[PDB]
Amino acid sequence: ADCRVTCRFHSTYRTRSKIVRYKRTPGNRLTSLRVKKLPNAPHCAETGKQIHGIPRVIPQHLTRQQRKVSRPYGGKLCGSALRAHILESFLNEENQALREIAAQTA
């Protein structure tokens, strides 16, 4: 009939942390259950996009395998950024090799 719910926190001030979802308990009473802020997943250093593969849970409670991605530069970068960094390093070395080294020969 009435479902007031009162408050489950030290202070009533409803900040982003103090938000509560409501469920019915096994004893037929309404329970404020705190809904915590979902932290974001790691985001790529370049690009700024979310890195794929890591769940949005704090990395403290995410084991080691679930907080990692199997690639070189797996968590710092996404694949496309790494594919571009690799190519720059190969292409740039070869630019000195086919320009400055080719100039030494010619």
Partner: protein
């Protein structure tokens, strides 16, 4: 026609990204597109020392590799094959043969570029 057996390429996608790799076979272009069997270096010999070279054999998509000028003449067609590597088991022995063949080449101061690491810097 750049893709050729005997061609060093840099893996640009995958767990083996940024690693050099030599093509043992250029696969028939199929519905899956163009793949190639590449035998490369997963972990370089070792650090400064005063030990061994891990290797990978896999059918990578040619569109995930960068053709480089570097050469290499590893026969490999004798053991590495489409039926081999695809077969689970037997392939581990071919990785072990390639590991040794590479360690031999480092110890004779051979193929320095293939056995050197590309310096990706973030």
């Amino acid at each position: 026609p750049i893709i050729k057996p005997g061609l060093v390429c840099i893996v640009l996608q995958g767990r083996h990204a940024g690693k050099k790799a030599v093509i043992v076979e250029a696969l028939p272009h199929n519905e899956r597109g163009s793949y190639a069997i590449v035998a490369g270096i997963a972990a370089l010999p070792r650090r400064i020392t005063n030990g061994r070279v891990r290797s990978f054999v896999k059918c990578m998509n040619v569109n995930h590799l960068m053709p480089t000028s570097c050469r290499l003449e590893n026969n490999y067609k004798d053991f590495i094959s489409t039926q081999t590597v695809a077969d689970v088991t037997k392939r581990r022995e071919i990785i072990e043969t390639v590991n040794k063949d590479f360690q031999r080449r480092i110890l004779e101061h051979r193929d320095t570029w293939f056995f050197t690491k590309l310096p990706i810097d973030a």
